[PDB]
Design a binder for this molecule. Structure first.
Ligand SMILES: Cc1cc2nc3c(=O)[nH]c(=O)nc-3n(C[C@H](O)[C@H](O)[C@H](O)COP(=O)(O)O)c2cc1C
Ligand SMILES: Nc1ncnc2c1ncn2[C@@H]1O[C@H](COP(=O)(O)OP(=O)(O)O)[C@@H](O)[C@H]1O
Ligand SMILES: [Mg+2]
Length: 147
């Protein structure tokens, strides 16, 4: 209902061990950005398009979850871009267009099942983003302003 959702934010570090350890880096936005999501953007896994600073637009998956740590029930958001970056981009602006919903959050009983799930979400996102209604969002002026 609030898709496609467009937002931009500084890329910031997270806590615990980064998902770089899984070969699947996940970029965070400051709390200010996540707080401005409409409530109807429920938790779960979404897919869409992203660029960093003035770079090209690439396919991405976003995880929207509950934060265990802040007062009230604050959400969290983290984006994995399906593009190999030559270096990190902390502090740069990540521009995102969230275009579709993949699945609700799920509980997994091992890292094996978690990693397999994430890889499957990525492969499914790549397929869904080829649909003409989603492929066109790559060309949105939203992304053209950043170049
Ligand atoms: C596409 C995608 C889907 C995810 N799905 C789930 C999920 O269904 N359930 C869950 O508990 N964690 C899920 N995660 C969580 C990541 O494994 C977790 O947030 C990890 O700690 C990344 O944060 P980090 O940068 O601190 O490592 C998902 C992550 C991604 C990228
Ligand atoms: N494909 C990519 N998608 C998301 N982040 C990437 C990607 N390639 C490199 N990065 C870098 O990885 C960082 C995320 O790594 P991660 O291990 O998840 O740590 P953290 O969540 O604490 O920032 C991003 O802030 C960014 O600088
Ligand atoms: Mg991360």
């Amino acid at each position: 209902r609030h898709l496609p959702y467009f937002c931009r934010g500084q890329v910031v570090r997270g806590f615990g061990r980064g998902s770089k350890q899984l070969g699947i880096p996940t970029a965070n936005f400051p709390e200010q950005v996540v707080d401005n999501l409409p409530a109807d953007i429920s938790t779960g896994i979404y897919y869409g398009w992203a660029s960093v600073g003035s770079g090209d637009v690439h396919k991405m998956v976003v995880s929207i979850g509950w934060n265990p740590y802040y007062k009230n029930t604050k959400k969290s958001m983290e984006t994995h871009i399906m593009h190999t970056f030559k270096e990190d981009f902390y502090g740069e602006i990540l521009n995102v267009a969230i275009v579709g919903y993949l699945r609700p959050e799920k509980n997994f009983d091992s890292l094996e099942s978690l990693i397999s799930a994430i890889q499957g979400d990525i492969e499914e996102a790549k397929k869904r983003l080829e649909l003409p209604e989603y492929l066109k969002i790559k060309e949105d002026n939203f992304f053209q302003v950043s170049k």
